[PDB]
Symmetry: D2
Subunit: 217 residues, 4 copies
């Protein structure tokens, strides 16, 4: 493959015991780090805030500094691939885990994601649609061995009450083959991201900007 | 349904990116809290310690104090059911999540479990088969609303080096209908458990004893 | 050196930046695990729930099963002693850590505890004095080496709104001499405890029951 | 009240039960974020890696973007001040918490920091003095109310074995007066920092670079 230009996603699973299923497609620009995605529900109205599906709704679009391939891009490029496993531990006792798999077809990516979330309080912000936005975020990546990224960030939404809603997020990424030694010696690597989400009860339109950095200006 | 007498399990997923799949059956005694289970691999040798599959490898076998039905037993009994979502956060950066679903057929239970584990160090105790046993365990249960248990325990194995291997484990249990009000007013509830596991690279034989308690002698 | 029959406590530090200081005296039964304590404020009215000072307000009162001494008691008995370091990580972002020291004078314990708690939201149950009780509790103990206990429990209060207030609690205990081999080989050890607190803005009246168990 | 140009530190407490006490002096540039510090032990040779005292070894040196004062600096500037409470939760079960206070005398800061660390395994990198450097670091800051900062970062050292040593770090900062509205509305704020440490068993020589950012 070359760098990605387009992608689709089928994402499904359950939140508080209630099944959900979405699909759609999007595109992005793998040199800029930007991507956008449209999703539509296959099982009626979502009963939970669509914002809970971020960050889960494609780091193949993410370059590393000075136009280098991120390990994600490299793994797409030679076709050896990777999977991700993410955990979100919310401050109010909720948990959401996800598994991420991909199939490549030239410069197009097909994502299959499975999520399980539970323990969202009936009156907390996820079940009342009270999440309003996700804060700008710094992701910290380390490679504890040659085929794994352990990444972390503190994830916060703003909400309608003005109180933020917090979780600890950890993403373990497992590669089909060794990450290039030149990527492995620049640790830690950070990535600054911004997202937007417009949404109804049945549809999402998401956009994301990403930029990797070892150091700041 | 009545109380369970027998069960089978199909359990599958991936550990460090490597797929695994097991099935088998067992039985137990729902008044005593005891159950045993035999499992066999459908995909060759496990490349990870089988002990990592405990606690994941049926609280329907668990009575509450003085022969009362546990909420698990009650949910089987009227057929309204429940699911579980468990998270294990290991001290060395590994994570393992699981989703648990059941189907009842009279006094027989069919479990379908899906697990994703990742970030196990190549030289840590899971990938070297160095777990030797699981410590006796106290599970602490609360019901933050009428259809959910949030349970927790500190989970430790002994290992061949003599160092214990630790994780934080949280199990969120989501019920199809409200838990009985008489169960909901006895919080917290604790459960003392013991397990044994004999195993090879392709087969497991597990046993478990459980006893619920609000207070001790 | 005898098992403890009476004790004093001086506990101080700050909560959300506001200094506090209490002292008092109590007693208990080291064969049974029970003790009780009275504390009075030296700096005016407490600005936070006094319940936040539990569990921090003496495991020298705790025996082990079958009349054995707990490690806490043995270290009092030989004078070698120990310190505790405790951390409470609250679900709403607050943190409270404490440092515990003791002087023994025959059967009397003097505690000097220093505490820093911070980050408690102005409308949370601690700052609105809305905590009503602490749930009964199981403490899981391990000894990762011969002079250290690492213990954990999930700590929950009931509150006036009905919704519980939770924290993760880790207590590390460090001994001046090795723990006896016979205690070391019985792991985990669990301890079941119940507490009561009656309080006003200046005074606390605390009781506790505790009992070690390995199995039920 | 001027921005800081020099500072002293007295830092004490215990690690694994062993008391330690250091003092010294340093300086820095409050327009640039840099500061450096020298510390000397008053109680003999340290029995643990001196790296464990970082990050704990002065954000009054930290400016905010475009020459604005950080909240730390503004609270020095008006004399209203603040305290910090920090917690480090290590991957191997150790815990280290600290309490930070300051006295200001014109452009000079006096710090008094109290620390308790415990649970560090005898064969871990802290007790074998095997920590070699601290990774560069991004601190995420939020203000859940008008006098409080709640900050977090994942803290990692490199060690002689090649394997990193990790901890979760939460710092709660409490202000004697409200933070300015204009600082409050810019959340999150991030801070990028680099540190160096040269040390012997009795002496530390510490430098730090820091720079706030909202975006890159």
């Amino acid at each position: 493959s070359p760098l990605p230009a387009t992608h689709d996603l089928h994402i499904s699973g359950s939140i508080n015991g209630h099944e959900f299923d979405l699909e759609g497609s999007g595109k992005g620009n793998a040199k800029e780090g930007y991507q956008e995605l449209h999703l539509k529900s296959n099982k009626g109205d979502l009963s939970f805030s669509p914002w809970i599906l971020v960050p889960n709704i494609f780091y193949q679009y993410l370059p590393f500094p000075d136009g280098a391939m991120s390990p994600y891009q490299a793994a797409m490029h030679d076709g050896s691939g990777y999977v991700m496993h993410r955990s979100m531990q919310f401050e109010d006792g909720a948990m959401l885990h996800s598994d991420h798999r991909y199939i490549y077809k030239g410069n197009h990516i097909k994502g299959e994601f499975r999520l399980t979330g539970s323990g969202f309080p009936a009156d907390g912000p996820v079940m009342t649609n009270s999440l309003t936005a996700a804060d700008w975020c710094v992701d910290k990546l380390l490679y504890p061995n040659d085929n794994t990224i352990i990444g972390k960030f503190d994830w916060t939404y703003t909400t309608t009450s003005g109180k933020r809603y917090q979780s600890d997020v950890q993403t373990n990424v497992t590669f089909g083959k060794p990450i290039a030694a030149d990527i492995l010696k620049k640790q830690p690597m950070f990535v600054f991201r911004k997202v937007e989400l417009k949404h109804t009860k049945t549809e999402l339109n998401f956009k994301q900007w990403q930029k990797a950095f070892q150091d700041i200006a």
